Write a protein that binds this ligand. Structure first.
Ligand SMILES: Cc1nc(C(=O)O)sc1CCOP(=O)(O)O
Ligand SMILES: C=C1C=NC(C(F)(F)F)=NC1=N
Length: 219
């Protein structure tokens, strides 16, 4: 069957997202350090300019997935349903324009399904379509993606919970160790980030601090 709501919420705690172009250091090493530090979930997101393509992309994906397996953390693939199926990934994350969530849910069996949502209606539709979790953002100003909607703070998260919507939620967009707390307090089940860890001088320590911080506010 699909993942349980309870387990999904635990996995979203410290959700690290990264592609080879999000760090000036060795990509594979940064991922391994994030996992060693405490990341509870990892998403393979290789996009933008200078992104790896073809065999080079697959090899990185395979290495990232191996680090995830060895750390006992699920491996999520961004957008590429075919790759997710080919690599036997633990899940897939899709956006609003990328595909038809209902069709993706049917094609991936019981894999974890994540959908990016930005409005109340999108959140409700995602759950109805079969999503196991929703990614809401950008919470704070970001420069890593540079193709996001306007910053929305934690007001939408609060509104969703106020209505009684219980779907697992992860916040994303400009999240740092210093602004993560309010996201959890608003009702999110975790925080997702790229730069806060990928560009940190000490990725392992960064993930560790996030782990402790999220644990504290979820308690
Ligand atoms: C991939 C992505 N999506 C966003 C959204 O708002 O949907 S924000 C984002 C990435 C931002 O990375 P960082 O943690 O470095 O700000
Ligand atoms: C654009 C995105 C928004 N949210 C998430 C996640 F945090 F994983 F839900 N991933 C993305 N790729």
């Amino acid at each position: 069957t699909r993942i349980s709501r309870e387990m999904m919420k635990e996995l979203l705690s410290v959700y690290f997202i990264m592609g080879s172009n999000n760090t000036k250091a060795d990509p594979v090493t940064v991922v391994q350090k994030a996992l060693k530090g405490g990341a509870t979930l990892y998403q393979f997101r290789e996009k933008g300019g200078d992104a790896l393509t073809g065999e080079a992309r697959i090899k990185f994906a395979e290495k990232a997935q191996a680090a995830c397996r060895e750390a006992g953390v699920p491996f999520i693939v961004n957008d590429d349903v075919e790759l997710a199926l080919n690599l036997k990934a633990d899940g897939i994350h899709i956006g609003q324009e990328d595909a038809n969530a209902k069709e993706v849910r049917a094609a991936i069996g019981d894999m974890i399904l994540g959908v990016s949502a930005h409005t109340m209606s999108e959140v409700k539709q995602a759950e109805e379509d079969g999503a196991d979790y929703v990614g809401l953002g950008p919470i704070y100003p970001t420069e890593t993606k540079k193709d996001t909607r306007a910053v929305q703070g934690v007001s939408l998260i609060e509104a969703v919970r106020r209505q009684g919507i219980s779907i697992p939620i992860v916040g994303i967009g400009g999240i740092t160790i210093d602004n993560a707390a309010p996201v959890i307090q608003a009702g999110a089940d975790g925080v997702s980030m790229i730069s806060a860890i990928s560009q940190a001088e000490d990725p392992e320590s960064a993930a560790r601090k996030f782990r402790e911080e999220i644990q504290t506010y979820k308690t």
